[PDB]
Write a protein that binds this ligand. Structure first.
Ligand SMILES: OC[C@H]1CC=C[C@@H](O[C@H]2O[C@H](CO)[C@@H](O)[C@H](O)[C@H]2O)[C@@H]1O
Length: 347
């Protein structure tokens, strides 16, 4: 029918939103404003309070200041994934080690399974992250969630994305990811496809990925040109290298970027949506590169204005929000479905 989910399409999902009613605080809708890293000492940038009128986004959610732990919001999000045809929810994971995290992960898996959506984990740069506690955490996540019907596998293996994987030396990664490594996961119950973050130039990233024994790489950033890896004119050559070296390239595409409510000094990274034309151009480049899998930045990174989740026009006494302009609130979901179709036609 051209409506089925695609299980090689990964959409980055954030579960860090709170409401006073459910979480005791409108978590993340309230957010600190970052000081300007070039702007000198004694800045008092303040905070966005997460009131109805003033939230930590340049856009405004159709669903309002929602809780990521509200089962009724989760239902709606899964129906949005079905509309977008995105079969894998790539869940931010911060190793909070608290009952609230454990509850929310279970609720997300349960809601996903009702709609045949799958869940994989996006392993964030949590405090003191290293290959030993990464192994322990991979073991824990596979043990706790690996038998859940919504847990993702690709050809029998779990898949993890590793954000800011460059913060760990290749010599450490080798211990975890080479078949001969001291603490290897290869050939164990806990083996997985490990997808590292390709940032800078090939002279740096090619030996990094090889020496670290990653199974593949992704690029994350929604803003074209932010890094070498997030410059789509490089994607044909990145794919050629991947294929020559037995690696899985999962380029990241997004609909735009803007984070100036929380980073007022970061305007150079703004990428305008142009009624969908930015998203179309980036998704076309991914497909043309001939890749096997695509990642989407993001479902709901509202702070960075990369979300495909529905947004609505809103002007409050405190801020005039951006919105989807000439397009309807669900335009980026239905346009994602269009591109998933073009991607499948290519596979
Ligand atoms: O998921 C990978 C990566 C994507 C974007 C931002 C990163 O989080 C940091 O920035 C946000 C604001 O946009 C903060 O709310 C988080 O606390 C930061 O860690 C995220 O790691």
């Amino acid at each position: 029918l051209g409506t089925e989910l695609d299980y090689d399409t990964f959409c980055f999902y954030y579960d860090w939103y709170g409401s006073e009613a459910i979480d005791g605080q409108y978590r993340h809708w309230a957010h600190a404003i970052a000081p300007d890293p070039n702007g000198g000492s004694g800045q008092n940038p303040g905070t966005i309070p997460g009131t109805q009128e003033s939230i930590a986004s340049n856009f405004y959610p159709q669903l309002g200041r929602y809780s990521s732990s509200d089962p009724n919001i989760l239902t709606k999000h899964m129906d949005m994934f079905v509309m977008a045809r995105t079969g894998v929810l790539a869940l931010t994971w911060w190793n909070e080690q608290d009952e609230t995290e454990a509850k929310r992960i279970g609720l997300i898996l349960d809601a996903a399974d009702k709609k045949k959506i799958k869940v994989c984990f996006h392993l964030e740069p949590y405090p003191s992250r290293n290959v030993q506690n990464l192994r322990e955490n991979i073991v824990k996540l596979i043990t706790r969630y690996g038998n859940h019907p919504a847990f993702y596998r690709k050809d029998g293996k779990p898949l993890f994305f590793i954000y800011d994987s460059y913060l760990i030396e290749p010599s450490e990664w080798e211990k975890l990811l080479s078949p001969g490594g001291s603490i290897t996961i290869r050939n164990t119950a806990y083996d997985a496809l490990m997808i590292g973050l390709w940032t800078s130039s090939p002279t740096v990233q090619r030996p990094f990925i090889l020496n670290a024994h990653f199974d593949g790489f992704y690029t994350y950033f929604a803003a074209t040109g932010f890094t070498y890896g997030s410059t789509p004119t490089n994607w044909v050559s990145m794919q050629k290298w991947a294929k020559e070296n037995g690696k899985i390239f999962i380029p990241s595409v997004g609909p735009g970027y803007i984070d100036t409510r929380i980073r007022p000094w970061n305007g150079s990274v703004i990428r305008t949506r142009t009624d969908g034309q930015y998203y179309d151009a980036m998704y076309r480049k991914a497909i043309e590169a001939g890749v096997s899998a695509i990642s989407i930045t993001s479902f709901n990174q509202w702070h960075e204005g990369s979300q495909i989740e529905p947004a609505v026009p809103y002007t409050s006494s405190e801020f005039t929000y951006l919105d989807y302009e000439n397009r309807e609130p669900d335009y980026y979901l239905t346009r994602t479905a269009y591109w998933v179709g073009k991607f499948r036609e290519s596979k």
